[PDB]
From a paper:
These maps led to the identification of an approximate 16-fold symmetry about the center of the dome positioned within the OMC. Within this dome there are 16 α-helices that appear nearly identical at this resolution. Based on the structure of DotG modeled within the PR (residues 791–824) and the homology model fit into the dome density (consisting approximately of residues 857–1046), we hypothesize that DotG extends from the PR to the dome, though a physical connection between the two structures is not observed. In contrast, the N-terminal extension of DotC was modeled as two relatively large helices positioned near DotG and bridging adjacent asymmetric units. Notably, this portion of DotC was only observed in either four or five of the 13 copies of DotC observed in each map.
The pathology associated with infection depends on bacterial delivery of effector proteins into the host via the membrane spanning Dot/Icm type IV secretion system (T4SS).
Residue numbers in the entry:
A (entry chain IM): 113 to 320
B (entry chain If): 208 to 266
C (entry chain JH), D (entry chain IH): 311 to 361
E (entry chain IK), F (entry chain HK): 38 to 188
G (entry chain ID): 23 to 162
H (entry chain Id): 24 to 160
I (entry chain HD): 110 to 162
J (entry chain IL): 42 to 65, 88 to 236
Amino acid sequence: LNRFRYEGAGVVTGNNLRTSYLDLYLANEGTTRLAGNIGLQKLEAVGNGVTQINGVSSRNLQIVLKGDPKVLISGFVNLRQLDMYGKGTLSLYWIKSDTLTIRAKKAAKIQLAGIVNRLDVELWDFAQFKGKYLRAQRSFVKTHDKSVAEISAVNHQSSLATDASDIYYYNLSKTRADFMAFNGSVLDMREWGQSDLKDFDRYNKQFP
Amino acid sequence: IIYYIQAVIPGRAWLIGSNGSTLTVREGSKIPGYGMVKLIDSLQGRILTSSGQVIKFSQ
Amino acid sequence: MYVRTNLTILSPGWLASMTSADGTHAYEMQKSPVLLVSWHGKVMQLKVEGL
Amino acid sequence: MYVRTNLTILSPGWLASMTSADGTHAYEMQKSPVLLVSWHGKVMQLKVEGL
Amino acid sequence: VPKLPCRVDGACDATIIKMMTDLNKKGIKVASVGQNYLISIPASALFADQSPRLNWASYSLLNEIAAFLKQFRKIAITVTSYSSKYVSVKRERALTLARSRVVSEYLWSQGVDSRIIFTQGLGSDKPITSYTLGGDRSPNARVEITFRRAV
Amino acid sequence: VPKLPCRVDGACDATIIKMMTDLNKKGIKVASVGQNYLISIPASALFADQSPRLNWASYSLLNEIAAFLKQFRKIAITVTSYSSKYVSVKRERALTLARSRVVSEYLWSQGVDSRIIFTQGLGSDKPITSYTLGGDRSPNARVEITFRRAV
Amino acid sequence: MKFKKPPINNPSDDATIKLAEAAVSVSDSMLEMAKVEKVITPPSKDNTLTIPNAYNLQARASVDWSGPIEELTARIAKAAHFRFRVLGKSPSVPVLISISTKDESLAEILRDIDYQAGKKASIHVYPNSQVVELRYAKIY
Amino acid sequence: KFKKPPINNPSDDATIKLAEAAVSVSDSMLEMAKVEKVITPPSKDNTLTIPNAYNLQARASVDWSGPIEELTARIAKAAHFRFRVLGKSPSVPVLISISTKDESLAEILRDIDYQAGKKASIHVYPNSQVVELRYAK
Amino acid sequence: GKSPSVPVLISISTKDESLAEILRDIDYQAGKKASIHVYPNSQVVELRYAKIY
Amino acid sequence: CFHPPYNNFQPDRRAVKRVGVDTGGGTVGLVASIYRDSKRKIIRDLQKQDIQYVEYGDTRTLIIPTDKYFMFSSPRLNEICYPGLNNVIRLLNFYPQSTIYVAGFTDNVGSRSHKRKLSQAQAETMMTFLWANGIAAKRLKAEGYGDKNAISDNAIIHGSAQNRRIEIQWFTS
Amino acid sequence: KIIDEQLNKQARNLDAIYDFNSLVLEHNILPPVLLEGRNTLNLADAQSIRISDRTYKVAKQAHFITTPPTWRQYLW
């Protein structure tokens, strides 16, 4: 119950599996629905697949993809690192981890939500990353040309944009630090109508 | 006994009590000390229950 | 000293004050060479001789 | 002689003394041209003119 | 009269007219009607492309117009910014608000005398030209400073 | 005012500068930050091999040290002795304490206008260099003299 | 080889030095009395229920005013495009407010104005009707 | 190319200390005022509401000082409303003074009740088209 | 205790002994107006004034 | 060709401009370049600026005056000191393995919590600025202390100007 | 002349620190003046020593004003 590999137009739908760790390899339309309380660490998808996993009870994970799969995962894990150099799309429910390191190169659309102490984001081009519904104490953001980033840091925020890129801070953290090199843009993008929205202080004030 | 939000998805919310007890809550359920959850607003950090209480983040 | 203006007087501490319908102010105060006035959110000094 | 300082005085013997909330001292004594104080365990003399 | 200044502090109306002429030949809209005054500057000489980064060479022109505004006597100034339509409404509103905030803060750092500086931005709410084919090069992207002359 | 002193007795900041430059050319480290100054001397210029004893040539160096040390109104002088890891903890602690005691007694014998001398030795508990190949030739085996300038 | 230390300022003034050396003790005394009044005072509420924020109140300003109240809040309301309202009788002695701030929003500018009013004056707002309502307090 | 620093910069240590001291004492005074000020809850703050009758939206200019009685009565006549008073007028009449150029009768009556305070109250009935003055004994 | 308005004055001029003997000489010259205690496991050095008047 | 606002965080070119204006002798230009970008020349330039450099043991520290290099009571860094900041990055390029500690201190006057907050903000701003010049975040740690260890007396004016400062330490291995 | 120029050079911060206006009591009353004292010792003569720990003394009684004062009439 530790090995799972499927290639070549495979549709697997199942639930109610208890395990400690199993390794998954998927390719060529693995229509994979897994609705058990499944703990795992290593998943690989070659490309052109859709996968729904409902229920994850594990405490370590390290996934890296190459083609374009589409995954929706319910549960929580300590995600360690993530790299993408293709056509990556990703959505995740909950993460209560410690440190995150995200690298995106070619084309990326990532929606994550959870609680992280400290994270680093590197976006090169055509990367839309959301930190909506995701809170951090230490935020480090490096954005290059044509990148889109959402950051919801709580305590300390640090960001640099090179050119032609958009950064939106959805919450005022206790410490703010932003820089723009050529045409990078850092903006608040808030409703301006919240009945109990806090204002700036002496320490939080920065002037772009 | 009091509760505070951790992270709000559209449809479900994460709660932590005063004792450290965790909770994942749907749009409609039952919570002791607050009653029945009536609306999950994910645009702002507010959720309203049947008893008339709104959960914010601690500071 | 008797004085008429439409400003606010600050320095000496006056004894009696009157105000018109139109906000014109009159003060009875002591003799003094100079006056302090809040004009429009600005602080100003006034010089009076002939005491 | 009325003196205000925060040091400590040794020689003549003051008639009265007062200490602030921060510890500044004030001493009441007789007339003398000289004084003898202590700085940090080190003795020092002190000169008073214009008696 | 030895103790009373005959004029206001270090002023020259010939210099006022001369600097107005230089700004008008430079390409800055100067408006004087009644006793109220308006100054309009295109944003393409001010910022980067859709971004609140300030060009270093523009600090000289900002210093010069700050000297001109110091040369008058006033009470309150409204400064606003307008732009094109790029992604949203809120993005444009926040961009104009931030740009107005930055230029107002630098102006207050400069030695202009005032009691009130009012900051707001709208983005692409109030158009000024039917022709809108340009981007940041389009002249409807602008900054405006309005005031009424004191006394 | 001619009856009053003009400066401190025997004080010349040019002479202080000159002897400080000479000492840093000699290689004894002089550090200045705020009002607390540090003087670092390698033990090889003063003591013999694992020795609580000095050569005769060290007295001229300590004499010029005292000549510089007259030039400050201070209160407390702290002297720490650090050594190389040789036999135990006991031998290093005792040797460092003996070296600090000897230099403290000669320093008090010289007429430095001080109030208190605090001496201690630590052996090799806190070095300042990971490169620990040498014996008494090691740079971290040294004597450090710290004080705070007082007004 | 020539030795330096970092802070190299302009030549100072003894008068400024003496004013500073008074000011530090004044600030210390004010600080300790503030903390003991804070600990002896049980606070109840904040002014958010009295005056919330609203949209179009997010426009900001920086001010340095040292006079009466009425002209200042009139300029505030005309920026706000809100209708003015005044309640109570004007006092003989003017209520004098001096605020020297730096780039704050309209809502909290008005909020700390109402805090520095004291017992004499009070501010209410109504965003549903866009009404700013000042009220003198009926004393004596 | 060029840019000046702010002109009144604290370029001296004494000036620096003065500015930060001013910041500290102003912040402490703000704290003292914030813990000092007593406010009222907006749930049960006693003030006149807006009865929003259609005849109550007229505008006028009125300057008047003196007793509330005939002022309220002639205001009610201008509003075509019946008027009544329950309570006793004491030995000292309750005296106010209104000097306004353009505001409506609703907020006029609201300010009237505000200056009345504890002594008397104004109630509006738009069902039975009446306005009444209630004294307090 | 509290320091009396008359100060306590101590003259010490010694040479090169341990801090224990230093403090013992200190309390001996203090005498009947002040005293010294040391709690070593608590690492506390303490003086106490005389409870008189 | 250069931009004073940090050159858009780009690794600066100076030697090509030097050899161009010296060829407009190339050998004299390059020996002048190696004389002008040498480490002792860099420290001499930092000495011409108001920055203190201390090298003792294997540790090296830099001392920055906040009043000289900042707007008053602000996390906003002053921009006029950009030759000093570019020289700071040029010197910091020489230690690509050592971890960096950065800390900040102020004077005594004010709320203790407030001055600790201001020091924390100042330290985080400085460490963010050097993080923007291509240094990995694993080598960093920031700290805003209060006034718990002062190199100068606070009650004296010039010492009070001295003690409020930014310290930067680094190890070697 | 020099010290008057230097005094008025920083006029706004003086009003910032000497906020009499916040200190004015609620009925347009200047609050009174109190003086503290600690560790009082008096030697009147021989056979006589009188000590106290702390003391307080009123200097100026509270009274009305029309305007709160400023630093100018104390300092200019």
